[PDB]
Each structure stands twice: as C-alpha cells, then as structure tokens.
Scaffold this active site. Sequence first.
Site, short mmCIF file in Angstrom:
data_model
loop_
_atom_site.label_atom_id
_atom_site.label_comp_id
_atom_site.label_asym_id
_atom_site.label_seq_id
_atom_site.Cartn_x
_atom_site.Cartn_y
_atom_site.Cartn_z
N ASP A 17 0.86 -1.18 0.00
CA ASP A 17 0.00 0.00 0.00
C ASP A 17 0.89 1.23 0.00
OD1 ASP A 17 -3.03 0.97 0.67
OD2 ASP A 17 -1.59 2.20 1.78
N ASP A 60 0.41 4.47 1.19
CA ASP A 60 0.35 5.51 2.23
C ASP A 60 0.01 5.01 3.63
OD1 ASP A 60 -2.29 4.90 1.98
OD2 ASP A 60 -2.96 6.83 1.22
N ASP A 100 -14.57 -15.22 14.60
CA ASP A 100 -14.75 -16.65 14.85
C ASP A 100 -14.33 -17.50 13.62
OD1 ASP A 100 -17.10 -15.91 13.40
OD2 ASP A 100 -18.49 -16.86 14.81
N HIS A 121 -11.32 -20.03 13.76
CA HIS A 121 -11.66 -21.39 13.34
C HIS A 121 -10.60 -21.92 12.37
CE1 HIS A 121 -14.60 -24.57 11.93
NE2 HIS A 121 -13.75 -24.52 10.91
N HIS A 149 -7.41 -24.90 12.83
CA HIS A 149 -7.09 -26.10 12.01
C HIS A 149 -5.56 -26.32 11.92
CE1 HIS A 149 -10.95 -27.55 10.83
NE2 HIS A 149 -11.29 -26.44 10.21
N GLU A 181 -13.36 -30.37 13.28
CA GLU A 181 -14.24 -29.20 13.04
C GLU A 181 -14.77 -28.60 14.34
OE1 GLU A 181 -14.99 -27.08 10.62
OE2 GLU A 181 -13.60 -28.17 9.44
N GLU A 209 -13.40 -15.34 19.96
CA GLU A 209 -14.41 -14.28 19.85
C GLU A 209 -14.72 -13.65 21.21
OE1 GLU A 209 -17.67 -14.74 16.96
OE2 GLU A 209 -19.02 -14.26 18.61
N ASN A 251 -19.03 -8.41 20.87
CA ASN A 251 -20.34 -9.06 20.76
C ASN A 251 -20.25 -10.58 20.70
OD1 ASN A 251 -21.98 -6.52 20.12
ND2 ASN A 251 -20.67 -6.61 18.28
N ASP A 260 -20.79 -14.55 21.04
CA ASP A 260 -21.91 -15.46 21.21
C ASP A 260 -21.42 -16.88 20.95
OD1 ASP A 260 -21.72 -15.93 18.35
OD2 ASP A 260 -22.71 -13.96 18.11
N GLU A 263 -22.59 -18.69 18.42
CA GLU A 263 -22.94 -18.96 17.02
C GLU A 263 -21.67 -18.88 16.18
OE1 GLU A 263 -26.81 -19.01 16.12
OE2 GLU A 263 -26.24 -19.82 18.10
N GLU A 270 -21.89 -15.59 12.28
CA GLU A 270 -23.01 -14.66 12.22
C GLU A 270 -22.65 -13.30 11.61
OE1 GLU A 270 -21.61 -15.81 14.98
OE2 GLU A 270 -20.71 -13.98 15.75
N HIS A 284 -18.78 -31.39 9.08
CA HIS A 284 -19.43 -30.15 9.49
C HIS A 284 -20.83 -30.36 10.11
CE1 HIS A 284 -16.50 -28.75 6.39
NE2 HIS A 284 -16.27 -27.82 7.31
CA LIG Z 1 -27.18 -13.02 8.37
CA LIG Z 2 -19.81 -16.06 16.71
CA LIG Z 3 -3.77 3.24 1.02
CA LIG Z 4 -20.63 -12.53 17.48
ZN LIG Z 5 -13.21 -26.05 9.61
#
Ligand SMILES: [Ca+2]
Ligand SMILES: [Ca+2]
Ligand SMILES: [Ca+2]
Ligand SMILES: [Ca+2]
Ligand SMILES: [Zn+2]
EC number: 3.4.24.27
Length: 316
Positions: free
Chosen positions: A57, A59, A138, A142, A146, A166, A177, A183, A185, A187, A190, A231
């Site tokens: 890049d 700058d 996440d 993840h 691995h 997995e 996370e 935030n 969770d 999940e 998301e 999965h």
């Molecule tokens: Ca969505």
């Molecule tokens: Ca999550």
């Molecule tokens: Ca730039």
């Molecule tokens: Ca989240």
């Molecule tokens: Zn995986």
Amino acid sequence: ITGTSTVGVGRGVLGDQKNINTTYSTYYYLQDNTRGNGIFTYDAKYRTTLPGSLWADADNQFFASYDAPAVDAHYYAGVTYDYYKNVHNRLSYDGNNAAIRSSVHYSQGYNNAFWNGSQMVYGDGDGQTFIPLSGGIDVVAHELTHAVTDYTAGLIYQNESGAINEAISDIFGTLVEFYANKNPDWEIGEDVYTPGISGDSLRSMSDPAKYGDPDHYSKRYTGTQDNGGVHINSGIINKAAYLISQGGTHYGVSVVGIGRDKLGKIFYRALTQYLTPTSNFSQLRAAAVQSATDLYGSTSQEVASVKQAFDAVGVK
Ligand SMILES: [Ca+2]
Ligand SMILES: [Ca+2]
Ligand SMILES: [Ca+2]
Ligand SMILES: [Ca+2]
Ligand SMILES: [Zn+2]
C-alpha cells in the site's frame, strides 16, 4: 520483506476502524513483525493461485473497500496469535512461532475460507450468502485453529475424527471471539453470513439443531457427504462443549456449567496431550475426562461436569 515496523490504520469488512501492524520499505506492507516470525497478508487478486502478492500500500491508510478483507484477515490473525500466546502459552500454530500467512480476494464469488495445510485462504463471498469471510473473528480463529490441530493431534478430516477436528475449530473460534469481545456469542459466522438476514448464522453451538445439525449421538449422520459429515456431526461435540461451559439440561440430563476459561483449558490439554489422528467421539470423552482430572482432580466438579455433558449428548 526487510524494513521498518510501523502502524497503519484502516477499516474492516463491517466498517469498523482499527490499527494494523505494517512494515515500511518504499511501500507499506501488511507484514506484522511484532508477533513471532511474523503475520503476512497477501492479495490473491481474484485468482486461485497462492499465495499471491504480499499486500503493498502506498500511504499506510487502508480505507478502500478492496482493502477491507485484508485489514480484517491481518488484524484477526494477530488477535488469534495473542489468544494462543497469553492464554495457552503457545507460540503460533506450530508452537515455535511459525509465520502466519493469509491470502484474501481468493477466486470470484467464493463462499468459503480454509487452512490449506500451509496458510489461510479467504473468499469474498458472493454478497448474499456471505460477505468477505475474514470479517468474522470466529471464522479467522476457526481456520487458524485447524493449523494448531494439524501440528498436534493431527485429526484426520474424515468421519468422527474430522467432526472432532471441526468442533475444536468452532470451540476455539468462539473462545477467541469472547477473548476479543466483540459481541461474543455461541454462534458460528453470524457476522459475515447472509447480510440480508439478521439473527442467523452458519452453525449454532448452543442449539445445533436450529440449523438441522445433530445435538445427540443417536442423530449422527452416517452417510458419505461432507467427508462423512464433518461439518454436521460436529454439532454433537459443540453442544457438549456449550454445556460444559454454560450448563443446562439437555434430553433430561443436567450439567452444571464451569465456564469458558476452564472449557478452553480442558480442551486444549485434550488436543495437545491425548488426542491422536484417528480419535473417535468416545476417545474424545476419555481424553476430556483425563484432562479435567489432570487439572482439577478426579473428584472435582469439573470432571463431573465433563462426564455429565457427554452423557447428555449420548457419547459414552
Ligand atoms: Ca445473516
Ligand atoms: Ca460467533
Ligand atoms: Ca492506502
Ligand atoms: Ca458474534
Ligand atoms: Zn473447519
């Protein structure tokens, strides 16, 4: 490349601004020298040839929409490195500070991310099923996990071994996370899944069955799809892990939660000390019990909760 370490600023996939470690030598490169032998982020330029070009890049400011996935891949890899170092005293994925490499802008409309045995790779998504995949911490954690698994237990990506592989990536992706928090969770994905639909995710650890994944061993997938359901059947282990941490009653079996920090310690020890490439679900249970025993004593609440959790998902 060789040069002077510095700090630049940019905007990630979700429009949030952050500082990123870069290296200066005529250009500013996405090369973070502050962590191990380095974190390196590459541009695959919509091709499938890897790794592509080390991101350069002019700058040190990364606010172009083309830059966003690189900013997040580069930043979240740093956060994941920090998690493993500060929490588990593990130096990069191999334990000896290996360089972490990622490429973004892989292919066109590619709705996945992966560790390819040597580096992480992130698609941009097609813009309706996924937006660029490195935008989820996440997801990044993840994939990097691995690499950790590959250098430790070596769980084969097939059948029960693969489902454990997995699940481990979902568990640590979630713990990372929460570490960055964020935030957090229970999940998966998301933040980057279906920008058109709020409240959903790719997989749920708290209720895998919400998206049709098994949450009990009796409901495991036994066919040939998805490498024998790696999965899919991970849902069984993710639910067990959720119960160990948070507690709950599942199919009539009650589990007292012991919290995230102990979940991480138990599972990291199982992974690095007791699991092998061909471990199945029952062997996972034995490894997890033995790990909790090692750490908290055979008559601890911690060992009891691990046993409860696996009983509840039907894993003997
Ligand atoms: Ca969505
Ligand atoms: Ca999550
Ligand atoms: Ca730039
Ligand atoms: Ca989240
Ligand atoms: Zn995986």
